[PDB]
Amino acid sequence: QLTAAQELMIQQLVAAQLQSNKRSFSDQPKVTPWPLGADPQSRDARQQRFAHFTELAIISVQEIVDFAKQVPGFLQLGREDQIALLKASTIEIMLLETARRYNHETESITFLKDFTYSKDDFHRAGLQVEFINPIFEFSRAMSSLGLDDAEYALLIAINIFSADRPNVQEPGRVEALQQPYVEALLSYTRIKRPQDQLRFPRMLMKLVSLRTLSSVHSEQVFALRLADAALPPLLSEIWDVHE
Amino acid sequence: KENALLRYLLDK
Numbered sequence: 440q441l442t443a444a445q446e447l448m449i450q451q452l453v454a455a456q457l458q459s460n461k462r463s464f465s466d467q468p469k470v471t472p473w474p475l476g477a478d479p480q481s482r483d484a485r486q487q488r489f490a491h492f493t494e495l496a497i498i499s500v501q502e503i504v505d506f507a508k509q510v511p512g513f514l515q516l517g518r519e520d521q522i523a524l525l526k527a528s529t530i531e532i533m534l535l536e537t538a539r540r541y542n543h544e545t546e547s548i549t550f551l552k553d554f555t556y557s558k559d560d561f562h563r564a565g566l567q568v569e570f571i572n573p574i575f576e577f578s579r580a581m582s583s584l585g586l587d588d589a590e591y592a593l594l595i596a597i598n599i600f601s602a603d604r605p606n607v608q609e610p611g612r613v614e615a616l617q618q619p620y621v622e623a624l625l626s627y628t629r630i631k632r633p634q635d636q637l638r639f640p641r642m643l644m645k646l647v648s649l650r651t652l653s654s655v656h657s658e659q660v661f662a663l664r665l666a667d668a669a670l671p672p673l674l675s676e677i678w679d680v681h682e
Numbered sequence: 683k684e685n686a687l688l689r690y691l692l693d694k
């Protein structure tokens with residue numbers, strides 16, 4: 440039912456994301472270790488937990504850019520549009536990738552091979568309850584959709600090619616690039632669950648949810664600033680913290 | 683903005 444062109448398109452996205460992902464696993468013993476045990480009033484341990492998370496965030500941004508560069512169409516856009524689309528999508532793709540790593544049985548997200556954290560751990564990494572509850576809520580709703588690799592890969596490509604992002608100078612081209620991926624996901628979902636026609640809409644609706652969650656994160660970011668910011672340069676640059 | 687660090691990642 441998938442055309443040969445669609446099978447190839449999807450195979451390459453799934454392979455592109457596996458290649459981007461194994462690059463991250465190469466530099467896992469290079470992230471600040473999560474403090475094992477440690478007195479719960481140690482301010483050094485508090486600092487390490489924050490740094491651990493912001494270093495996982497940096498690896499996530501590297502995976503995202505590395506994947507984007509492999510999505511056909513992406514490198515043919517102007518450089519400034521490439522930047523505009525990546526600046527807007529980064530948080531949203533980070534959250535889709537967090538959702539993919541959620542375990543509903545144990546209610547915990549596993550970053551890289553085996554950095555498994557609960558809500559308590561997100562809070563000890565310096566995150567506020569206003570952001571943590573939605574993240575886990577979104578992850579829980581994504582889990583029930585039961586997305587596979589092809590579906591995540593396609594949804595991410597679709598999310599990157601959102602024409603209405605701020606500062607995109609050629610939205611016509613960007614929207615035109617979104618269409619083959621939307622159509623590939625429409626055909627893929629129709630084959631996987633041919634009885635459930637509302638699965639494809641339910642997935643596109645998550646992109647609506649990701650817009651709100653993007654705002655919730657910007658509030659979290661302005662909240663860090665008013666309490667000892669200390670986000671690394673790549674992260675404070677992308678998310679426009681200083682300029 | 684220059685976005686120097688994102689550009690660096692895009693370059694290689």
Ligand SMILES: Cn1cnc(S(=O)(=O)N(Cc2ccc(-c3cccc(S(C)(=O)=O)c3)cc2)Cc2c(F)cccc2Cl)c1
Binds near residue numbers: 496533549551564565
């Ligand atoms: C206070 N604070 C501490 N850290 C922050 S963050 O803004 O840097 N951010 C941390 C973060 C961001 C992304 C990931 C992430 C996502 C996908 C895959 C991977 S992986 C290690 O499998 O490559 C890592 C992990 C931590 C806060 C944050 C989250 F936790 C979770 C999702 C989004 C955000 Cl945005 C604020």
